[PDB]
Nucleic acid binder design. Structure first.
Ligand SMILES: [Zn+2]
Lengths: 98, 304, 115, 69, 64, 256, 131, 171, 62, 57, 58
RNA sequence: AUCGAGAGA
């Protein structure tokens, strides 16, 4: 569909994997990278766009163990949602207060 | 460590101004990767309504049809984007546009000479009738059920005094533009912000004290409201660094090159969102944050 | 091309979000590589950028007829005085931000208005 | 030719300001800088659009094929 | 033929600037005479490049 | 398929790294990548863990076959306290470590670059490139290393690992120096072209001695004793003769 | 374990066209013929002329992982800790050996009598500095 | 002279002569000189450099030795001369404005720039020849930055949003 | 002026040899302006879709 | 005959003028822009003789 | 020949139409200026083709 | 089809 697992770069145990996301760019890539690097269990995280003219984003996650790159990705997405929710709530409160 | 709870504890917003077009607010203790995501989404991801398809019926003016249609497309509209859905492009044009996703404008202006023009006059508004075609002449035509939904809010351009075309007697323009939802990453005519950027809070680190006649010129190297003088001792200090645009005029002087360093506060952003007119800047920022959150949530719910 | 022989084809239509944005919020519409200048030595393009920005700020028109300046009265000095008076910096440099990552670039970027 | 509706660099609508700019130059003895400032054009990217417009459509309009001359 | 290298310079002017010595930089600009001399040099360079782009085209085919 | 094989093996791009005219290399990066490398591979460059990992994954992409180990391998930081900090040379080392095939020793190359040691301060040794087990330990990468230059790092990698590895290294360095130049962009301006007050006074003082050199050279050419006035009748007559005679004109031009 | 240790008196510091790094010249307080030139990140560890530093070269600090809770290392006793590789050994004179280290690009030249520098082998070694 | 040109006083009139205005220094009035007589008369390029008992004439302005196109180049005394020549050659190859009476013509090809602008930086001779009637190009905000990596050799990068607002458009 | 005979058709650079045997027009070829791209392999070429749909290769089915 | 001369540039003369070339006397005034057009009327040519030559004085 | 710019725009030509060119078959043509020897002046000439013209010719 | 003008690297 939208998220794609690059099976030719994924570890057998799942500790390392590479993901391809369509119709994405630096906007989501850098946010996901920042929110995933905060995971104490991930060893390597980075985003790369193969070609600028194409709408594809690549995410690399390498965990230290006891987890999965997919699990790290899910945790990063959840934490990004929580960060967006808290900034929205604080902005709403400041708008109301003024 | 880092956590959403710690970010909530350390996060603050300082709204400095808020108008119907421009909002100036600060994001404090947030990451550049998130501030930039908000900025990019505001610029080129928040949907808006602008003219896309133009159905010319006659154009005998100097302006060619493609230029006129492009110039019509560039006009911003006072339409709430939530009042209409998105167009499914796969459908044929017979039923691609429905009553709930397209707003149909019209323009029918015909120039004729004014026989009552005063002699020796040069003003085209007295010499001719309809010599100038303005955006306010884009008449909204309600269709279907939207005659009831748009009854309270008419579809008028954000700027009605935009000069769309000029005419001379005998020349007529008769078109019918369809305006739909679109994002600023598709075409720049859809971006709901004039400019929506940010900047790091400037930092002016005074290392050695500057006093006396030297403090006079040190203050002048900045904008007048930034650097002040202490009442007790004739020192120099930073009153408001928000009022400073980094021109590094100090570093041009060897007198003050060794007595102050210029930097930034790397997690203190100063946003400035100017809207085109369709929606308020605070709502634009709300929608950008919600777009980022929904993008993350949709990616999470996508089955890997 | 500009009026200094700096011709060149257009590679890609760079989106405005990925374009670098200045502190004042303006993204340039033409990006020219700094490596085109050292071999050609078209310093008139730099001077035109300086004078164009100064004139756009002050609402005036700057005359560029040859031999109106000399060694003592440098156009760099003249347009730098105008820019510093307008509040921008003397050397025409603007602190810009990366449009893809968001961080401020290493040094102030040289921006201006050229024909 | 005809005033650009939106500024190229940023996107601020400057197309509704050409006539008012001409009025500010004509009626009041305001120079171009003061007139641009009063019109609300702050960034020099916006200032150049109205400062340097040529408005060639006025010269284009005198060749009207639909009117007896 | 009059000993003047340019109308500005008096006949047989023993000066480096008269003979083409440009004491000027592209940062600060060059005087009209030095501009004229630099145009001479640039025109010669353009001519030489135009000739040299194909002065050696017959040799390759004769060998090959 | 015959012409396909001919083009992919004999006429292909990476098998023509060296010109047969003199055996020198003809491929490499040119301007932005060269300046980006000069800025990245200096002592002044430090990168946090996230920045280092982002640069590494931007240049090298295992899912595209860019990695020989199926899993990106990194290095310990060159600074442990107060907080971890890598270096640009460590980014070069990691690039080599991930593109160079395993089960082989790293490149041991000692070369120089185009930038002297006086352009980095007193006591610097950044002119002397030094590799050891595929780890850039000294010097800056320059035009002499990546680009069309003999006995640089790219040429040495070509020689030791075949043409494919040198092609991969050129591609990886191109992607790396492109992504680096995006975040830390390179620019030139008017202040680069300016001298100081002391520089301008030096230039003026020296150029003030050029007023009389033409006259002195003319006096030497016309076999007249020095300190003769520029409008002396005999000097003018000799200069007239020199103007008439093409060879004497050429001699005067050469001396001046 | 430790391979070298001394109290060094910094004598000269200059940035040299750099902003974050600087090159120092440290002379040992006790050993009369031991000297040092080192490049340090002076934004993470500022130093000054006529200072005193406690440098120590250790084969380990007891693959790299960010520090976690309840982790002990030799680095906890020191302020500034680097990590590099020995790439050259020189014989300046009789009973004088100079060892060259490169910490990811930052170069150290530790010269001294080989009685104390005999432990310094050509391999990866941690450098630790303390005020 | 000594083995120079043949001496004599050669007054000329009539057709096809080449003439230029130069300021006669005595009595300070305009004078007209030709190529034949120019090579023997001293003509200072600037009133600051008149030498006593040397110069008889002086240029009205140093810029009246250049062509129209050469005069319309901004700050051309700061450029390399081949680049000035390239500019002269390329300013006549621009998609500008040929004219305004384009509805009364049947030319085989016409290249017209939709929206041109008067330059902020322009010579004083730009107004004298009325080039405002024919705007050649447009003013743009140009950053001298090495940021994209797509514009190394001589290529350049155009903002997509600006291009989507009719920047550089032509027919 | 004189009409070219059968000898002049085979004589010089425009003759039959140097213009139709030592150099020919070819099917399955293309020409365009070149623009840089650093996100493509150093041994690769970037071909637009306009060329990619006209150029073709005979691949026998199996 | 005058129209032929203006259209072709060929100087069909039974006697020959005091000129060297016989063709390319009239150029087509191109209208790419006003700069091109105005420079058409300010150019002076040495002649087609020197185009096909090697001496560059 | 003597029409003011107002009359020029009235007669469909241009505001500041300039002359110097001809119209043939709807295609505008110009007789390009050429450089020729100065008239009515005897100029001494050295040319190898003068000797190449015949024999004993200097 | 031929000869004239011009343009791009
Ligand atoms: Zn603007």
């Amino acid at each position: 569909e939208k998220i794609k697992l690059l099976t030719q770069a994924t570890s057998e145990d799942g500790t390392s994997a590479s993901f391809q996301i369509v119709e994405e760019d630096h906007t989501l890539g850098n946010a996901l990278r920042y929110v995933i690097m905060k995971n104490p269990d991930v060893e390597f995280c980075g985003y790369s766009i193969p070609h600028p003219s194409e709408n594809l984003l690549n995410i690399r996650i390498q965990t230290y163990g006891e987890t999965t790159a997919v699990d790290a990705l899910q945790k990063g997405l959840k934490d990004l949602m929580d960060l967006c929710d808290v900034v929205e709530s604080k902005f709403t409160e400041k708008i109301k207060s003024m | 460590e880092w956590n959403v709870e710690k970010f909530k504890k350390d996060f603050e917003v300082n709204i400095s101004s808020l108008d119907a077009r421009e909002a100036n607010f600060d994001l404090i203790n947030i990451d550049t990767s998130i501030a930039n995501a908000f900025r990019r989404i505001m610029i080129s991801e928040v949907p808006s309504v602008a003219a896309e398809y133009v159905y010319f019926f006659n154009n005998t003016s100097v302006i060619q049809d493609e230029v006129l249609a492009h110039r019509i497309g560039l006009v911003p509209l006072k339409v709430d984007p939530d009042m209409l859905t998105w167009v499914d492009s796969n459908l044929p044009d017979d039923e691609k546009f429905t009553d709930e996703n397209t707003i149909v404008l019209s323009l029918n202006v015909k120039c004729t000479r004014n026989p009552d023009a005063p002699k020796g006059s040069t003003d085209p508004k007295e010499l001719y009738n309809n010599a100038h075609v303005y955006a306010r002449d884009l008449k909204f035509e309600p269709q279907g059920r939207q005659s009831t939904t748009f009854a309270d809010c008419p579809v008028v351009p954000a700027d009605p005094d935009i000069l769309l075309a000029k005419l001379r007697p005998g020349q007529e323009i008769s078109l019918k533009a369809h305006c739909i939802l679109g994002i600023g990453g598709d075409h720049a005519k859809f971006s709901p912000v004039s400019t929506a950027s940010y900047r790091l809070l400037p930092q002016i680190n005074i290392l050695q004290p500057i006093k006396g006649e030297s403090a006079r010129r040190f203050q002048k190297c900045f904008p007048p409201g930034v650097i002040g003088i202490d009442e007790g001792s004739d020192e120099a200090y930073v009153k408001d660094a928000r009022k400073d645009t980094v021109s590094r005029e100090v570093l041009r002087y060897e007198e003050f090159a060794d007595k102050v360093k210029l930097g930034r506060v790397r997690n203190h952003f100063i946003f400035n969102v100017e809207s085109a007119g369709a929606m308020t800047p605070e709502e634009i920022f709300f929608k950008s944050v919600r777009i980022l959150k929904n993008k993350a949530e949709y990616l999470k719910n996508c089955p890997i | 091309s500009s009026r200094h022989g700096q011709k060149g084809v257009c590679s890609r239509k760079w989106p405005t979000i990925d374009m670098p944005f200045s502190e004042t919020g303006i993204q340039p519409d033409i990006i020219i590589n700094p490596h085109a200048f050292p071999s050609r030595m078209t310093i008139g393009m730099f001077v035109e950028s300086l004078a164009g920005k100064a004139g756009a700020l002050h609402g005036i028109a700057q005359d560029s007829t040859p031999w109106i300046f000399n060694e003592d009265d440098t156009p760099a000095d003249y347009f730098g005085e105008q820019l510093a008076k307008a509040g921008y910096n003397y050397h025409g440099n603007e602190p810009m931000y990366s449009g893809a990552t968001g961080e401020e670039l290493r040094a102030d970027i040289y921006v201006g208005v050229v024909y | 030719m005809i005033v650009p509706v939106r500024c190229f660099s940023c996107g601020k609508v400057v197309g509704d300001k050409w006539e008012s700019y001409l009025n500010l130059l004509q009626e009041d003895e305001l120079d171009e800088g003061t007139a641009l400032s009063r019109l609300g054009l702050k960034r020099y990217c916006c200032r150049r659009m109205i400062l340097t417009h040529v408005d060639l459509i006025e010269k284009f309009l005198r060749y009207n094929p639909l009117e007896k001359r | 033929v009059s000993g003047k290298t340019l109308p500005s310079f008096k006949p047989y002017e023993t000066d480096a600037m008269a003979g083409g010595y440009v004491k000027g930089r592209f940062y600060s600009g060059i005087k009209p005479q030095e501009y004229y001399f630099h145009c001479m040099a640039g025109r010669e360079g353009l001519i030489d490049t135009a000739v040299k782009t194909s002065r050696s085209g017959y040799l390759q085919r004769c060998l090959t | 398929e015959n012409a396909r094989a001919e083009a992919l093996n004999l006429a292909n791009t990476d098998s023509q790294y060296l010109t047969p005219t003199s055996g020198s290399p003809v491929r490499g990066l040119i301007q932005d990548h060269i300046s980006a490398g000069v800025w990245l591979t200096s002592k002044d460059s430090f990168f946090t863990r996230e920045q280092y990992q982002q640069y590494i994954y931007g240049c090298i992409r295992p899912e595209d076959g860019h990695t020989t180990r199926s899993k990106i391998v990194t290095l310990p930081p060159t600074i442990f306290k107060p907080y971890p900090l890598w270096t640009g040379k460590q980014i070069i080392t990691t690039v080599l470590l991930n593109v160079t095939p395993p089960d082989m020793p790293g490149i041991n190359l000692i070369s120089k670059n185009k930038i002297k040691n006086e352009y980095w301060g007193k006591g610097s040794l950044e002119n002397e490139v030094l590799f050891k087990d595929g780890a850039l330990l000294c010097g800056i990468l320059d035009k002499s290393q990546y680009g069309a230059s003999k006995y640089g790092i790219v040429h040495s990698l070509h020689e030791v690992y075949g043409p494919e590895v040198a092609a991969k290294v050129l591609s990886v360095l191109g992607r790396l120096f492109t992504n680096y130049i995006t975040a830390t962009a390179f620019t030139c301006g008017m202040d680069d072209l300016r001298l100081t007050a002391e520089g301008n006074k030096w230039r003026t003082d020296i150029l003030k001695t050029s007023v009389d050199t033409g006259r002195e050279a003319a006096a030497e050419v016309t076999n007249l004793d020095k300190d003769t006035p520029a409008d002396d009748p005999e000097l003018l007559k000799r200069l007239q003769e020199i103007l008439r005679d093409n060879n004497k004109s050429g001699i005067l031009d050469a001396v001046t | 374990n430790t391979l070298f240790d001394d109290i060094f008196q910094v004598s000269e510091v200059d940035p040299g066209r750099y902003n974050k790094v600087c090159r120092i010249e440290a002379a040992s307080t006790t050993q009369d013929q031991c000297k040092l030139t080192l490049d340090i990140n002076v934004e993470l560890f500022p130093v000054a002329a006529q200072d005193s530093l406690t440098v120590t070269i250790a084969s380990s600090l007891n693959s790299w992982r960010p520090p976690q809770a309840g982790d002990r290392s030799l680095a906890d006793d020191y302020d500034y800790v680097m990590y590099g590789t020995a790439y050259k050994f020189e014989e300046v004179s009789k009973d004088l050996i100079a060892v060259y280290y490169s910490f990811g690009g930052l170069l150290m030249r530790l010269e001294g009598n080989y009685r104390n520098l005999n432990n310094l082998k050509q391999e990866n070694a941690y450098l630790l500095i303390r005020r | 002279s000594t083995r120079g040109q043949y001496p004599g006083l050669y007054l000329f009139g009539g057709h096809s002569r080449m003439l230029r205005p130069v300021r006669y220094l005595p009595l300070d009035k305009e004078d007209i000189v030709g190529p034949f007589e120019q090579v023997y008369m001293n003509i200072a390029v600037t009133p600051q450099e008149i030498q006593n008992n040397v110069h008889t004439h002086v240029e009205f302005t140093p810029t009246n030795i250049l062509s129209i196109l050469a005069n319309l180049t901004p700050f051309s005394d700061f450029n390399q001369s081949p680049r000035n020549m390239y500019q002269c050659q390329m300013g006549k190859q621009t998609m500008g404005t040929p004219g305004v009476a384009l509805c009364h013509r049947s030319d085989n090809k016409l290249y017209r720039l939709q929206t041109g602008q008067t330059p902020i930086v322009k010579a004083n001779l730009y107004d004298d020849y009325g080039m405002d009637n024919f705007p050649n190009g447009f003013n743009a905000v140009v950053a001298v930055i090495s940021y994209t990596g797509y514009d190394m050799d001589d290529a350049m990068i155009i903002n997509k949003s600006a291009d989507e607002r009719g920047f550089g458009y032509g027919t | 002026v004189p009409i070219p005979g059968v000898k002049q058709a085979l004589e010089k650079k425009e003759g039959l040899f140097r213009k139709h045997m030592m150099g020919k027009r070819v099917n399955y070829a293309a020409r365009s302006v070149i623009s840089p791209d650093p996100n493509i392999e150093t041994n690769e070429i970037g071909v637009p879709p306009v060329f990619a749909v006209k150029l073709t290769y005979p691949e026998p089915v199996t | 005959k005058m129209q032929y001369f203006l259209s072709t540039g060929n100087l069909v003369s039974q006697s020959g003028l005091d000129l060297q070339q016989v063709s390319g006397y009239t150029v087509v005034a191109e209208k790419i822009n006003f700069y091109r057009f105005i420079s058409h009327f300010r150019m002076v040519h040495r002649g087609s003789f020197f185009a096909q030559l090697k001496t560059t004085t | 020949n003597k029409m003011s710019p107002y009359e020029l725009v009235q007669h469909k030509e241009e505001s500041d139409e300039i002359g110097g060119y001809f119209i043939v078959n709807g295609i505008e043509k110009l007789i390009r200026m050429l450089i020729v020897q100065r008239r009515n002046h005897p100029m001494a000439i050295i040319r190898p083709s003068f000797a190449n013209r015949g024999a004993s010719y200097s």
